[PDB]
Ligand binder design. Structure first.
Ligand code: SAH
Lengths: 49, 48
């Protein structure tokens, strides 16, 4: 588990734009599936997450 | 058959197909149904 303060299994600091963009695209693709979930539903689900 | 047309009136005016949720156009659906001879199959199944 990601123990907070653990020098090894800590939280990933030093993130850049490319990782965020890749997330954005795949999440918009994986969560939409094949039309299973609406775009707005996905949007506020991520807002809450 | 009067509330159906009501609902497709609702569907046409306000659904906003966009891109994620589009529909197969009705000509394509009817071509698929007739190309399978669905009417002939139904008649033969009912008649036998
Ligand atoms: N197992 C599945 N995986 C992905 N999509 C599925 C699915 N089962 C049903 N669907 C649905 O199938 C749709 C594809 S478009 C639906 C076909 C056509 N537009 C029509 O209206 O007849 C998607 O909206 C999706 O919600």
């Amino acid at each position: 588990p990601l123990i907070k303060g653990h020098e090894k299994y800590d939280l990933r600091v030093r993130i850049d734009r490319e990782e965020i963009e890749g997330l954005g695209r795949n999440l918009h693709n994986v969560l939409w599936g094949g039309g299973g979930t609406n775009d707005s539903e996905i949007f506020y689900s991520l807002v809450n997450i | 058959d009067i509330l159906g047309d009501f609902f497709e009136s609702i569907i046409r005016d306000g659904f906003k197909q966009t891109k994620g949720q589009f529909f197969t156009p009705t000509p394509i659906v009817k071509f698929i149904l007739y190309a399978l001879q669905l009417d002939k199959l139904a008649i033969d199944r009912l008649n036998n």
